[PDB]
Amino acid sequence: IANQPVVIDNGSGVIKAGFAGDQIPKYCFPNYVGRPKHVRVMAGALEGDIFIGPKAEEHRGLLSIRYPMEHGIVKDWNDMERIWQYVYSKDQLQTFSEEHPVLLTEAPLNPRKNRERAAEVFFETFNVPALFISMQAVLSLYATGRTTGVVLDSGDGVTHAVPIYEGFAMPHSIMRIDIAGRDVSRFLRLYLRKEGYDFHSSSEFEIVKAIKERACYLSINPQKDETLETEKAQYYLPDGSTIEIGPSRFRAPELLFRPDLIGEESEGIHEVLVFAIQKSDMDLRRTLFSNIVLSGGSTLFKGFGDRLLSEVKKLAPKDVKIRISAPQERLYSTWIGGSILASLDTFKKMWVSKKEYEEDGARSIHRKTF
């Protein structure tokens, strides 16, 4: 026995949510809380001091933004409860919580303590009847409806590649990199001070993030493309100010393939990705050549998959046809896939009742992990 569950597609930057069997996440709001810088002695103005969404984005000025979650590992768990309480807002739910099944998201390569504390929240502070969350890549595959695939997510500062054969991942061939657009914008901030500009405020930095997402693409041959002169079509701020560009429009996003240039013993998404592919079956790579699942919204770049095709030619196999799946609802793919799963009578076997948590809890977490 249950109610209609809700799929909460936790984007590393923007969390999303929405009831079962639907097509579009009901809510789409980010992951940070602002608190006012200035206080007042005046009587009659606003209250709250904790805002997320249009309230925060509305009056960004005093609300000092702080991202509580880092690579899934959140440190403001209490504030996450407040965030989920905000998910239970009047404008948000007006529903109950201890009487409905739900669905959140889970990326791999994580400490169990996160799931442990999560169960503590939803089953100590809440009394959720049944709830089970699994690997996000399968949800993307649900959106595809394709047995095998190479899913690559793209969070704000989180990325990971997973190959799955008919609903079976490869634990010995799954990789992850701790970065996405987060340090890309931070690196753009670096470029800003490289040519003398600081955008040290939190909101200011998110504005920089929006600028990045607004004007950035991929180049063909980076060192050869460096030989030209960027004309820097200046954009003009909401404040009304000159915005130069530099190589940032193409150089800054390729930091992903130059972690040594940023200071990290890593190689590249496609590099370690194809390495894990090499660790897979001699035969399944053939399937994965056409089964290339693109996911995550950080992927929005001109010639993104095209430069990725160039990367494929860099890591060329022994002449075998390859194909990439590049949909348009890559962020929504996981939410919709969960909605598909949430629209299944198979969750009876795929769930864990709260009574099970009452009986064991931690042991149910360890044993009934997946």
Partner 1 sequence: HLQQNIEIPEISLPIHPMITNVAKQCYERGEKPKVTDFGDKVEDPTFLN
Partner 2 sequence: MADPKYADLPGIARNEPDVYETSDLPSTSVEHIIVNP
The span from the CA of 332 to the CA of 247, in Å, is 31
- How far CA 98 is from CA of 4, 57, 90, 353, in Å, comes to 13, 31, 17, 12
Nearer to ligand ADP, 13 or 149 (CB): 13
Using the rule CB under 8 A, give the single segment among 45-53, 110-118, 127-135, 284-292 that binds partner 2: 284-292
CA 54, distance to chain mean position in Å, is: 20
The span from the CA of 299 to the CA of 57, in Å, is 24
Binds 296, which of partner 1, ligand ADP, partner 2, none (CB < 5 to 8 A, cut-off by type)? ligand ADP
Between residue 172 and residue 201, which ones bind ligand ADP under the rule CB under 6 A?
180-181
Between residue 324 and residue 353, which ones bind partner 2 under the rule CB under 8 A?
324-328, 330
Binds 95, which of partner 1, partner 2, ligand ADP, none (CB < 5 to 8 A, cut-off by type)? partner 1
Nearer to partner 2, 121 or 300 (CB): 300
Using the rule CB under 8 A, give the single segment among 49-57, 92-100, 167-175, 197-205 that binds partner 1: 92-100
The span from the CA of 289 to the CA of 302, in Å, is 22
Q: Does residue number 84 form part of the binding site for partner 1 (CB under 8 A)?
A: no
The span from the CA of 315 to the CA of 270, in Å, is 8
Binds 19, which of partner 1, partner 2, ligand ADP, none (CB < 5 to 8 A, cut-off by type)? partner 1
Nearer to ligand ADP, 35 or 176 (CB): 176
Closest CB 135 distance from partner 2, rounded Å: 23
The span from the CA of 256 to the CA of 277, in Å, is 19
Q: Does residue number 343 form part of the binding site for partner 1 (CB under 8 A)?
A: no
CA 244, distance to chain mean position in Å, is: 29
For the chain, state the CA radius of gyration: 22
Binds 316, which of partner 1, partner 2, ligand ADP, none (CB < 5 to 8 A, cut-off by type)? partner 2
Tokens in use for 50?
Answer: 């904790």
Question: Of residues 2, 309, 340, 344, which one binds partner 2 by CB under 8 A?
Answer: 309
DSSP class of residue 124?
A: I
Between residue 15 and residue 54, which ones bind partner 1 under the rule CB under 8 A?
19
Nearer to ligand ADP, 46 or 210 (CB): 210
Q: Which of 115, 117, 108 is nearest to 136 (CA)?
A: 108
Contacts of 9 (CB under 8 A, 6+ apart): 15, 16, 17, 25, 105, 331, 332, 334, 335, 338
The residue nearest ligand ADP at its CB is 11
Contacts of 290 (CB under 8 A, 6+ apart): 321, 322, 323
Binds 1, which of ligand ADP, partner 2, partner 1, none (CB < 5 to 8 A, cut-off by type)? none
Q: Which of 252, 247, 191, 181 is nearest to 199 (CA)?
A: 191
Residues lying near partner 1 in the complex (CB under 8 A): 3-4, 19, 94-95, 100
Residues lying near ligand ADP in the complex (CB under 6 A): 11-14, 153-156, 158, 180-181, 213, 296-298, 300, 331
